[PDB]
């Protein structure tokens, strides 16, 4: 058994210009 | 003063769906003059498209492109307008 | 592009613990509109969220709940920011 698992966790933040 | 006179509506501030974009609008007229932002919060990016209407009143359409839920603000001189941030749930294509 | 415009620093960006918050910031106002992203990667899952503020200073906040060698990426517009993803050593409580 060779595997490496591994828990990932996001969050995004996109916003503008003026 | 500033931001708690700005208005803000739209589908785009109540739900969404992945892959489809979600529009609103927003008002000034009536607040002061500066800069205004959006920022959408999120378990994915979000391609955001802005447009100043000739009318003091511009409009917003938003792309992302995961299910989950969402929070879409709106800032006028870096403060909320009211009910900023909208809290929006985003549920995959029917 | 833009990412390399972007810093980020802060005692979460250096070493955390379990069940403990732990905070960095961003640095965006040199690098204009664009979208962040944090993944955090390890053990076990991180609850995350932004603090942006009325000084336009950006924070982030995360808490683990597992001891172990995790990593934060910080990417702006998808490239890397200077120094990420960072190694951060998670400790017992």
Redesign the interface.
């Known amino acids: 058994p060779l595997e490496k698992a ?13 | 003063g500033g931001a708690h006179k700005v208005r803000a509506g739209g589908p785009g501030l109540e739900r969404a769906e992945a892959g489809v974009p979600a529009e609103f609008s927003i008002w000034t007229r009536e607040a002061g003059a500066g800069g205004l932002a959006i920022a959408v919060e999120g378990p994915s990016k979000a391609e955001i498209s802005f447009e100043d209407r000739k009318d003091g009143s511009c409009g917003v359409a938003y792309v992302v492109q995961e299910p989950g839920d969402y929070e879409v603000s709106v800032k006028f001189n870096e403060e909320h307008i009211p009910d900023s941030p909208f809290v929006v749930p985003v549920a995959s294509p029917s």
């Open positions: 591994s828990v990932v966790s996001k969050l995004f933040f996109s916003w503008t210009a003026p």
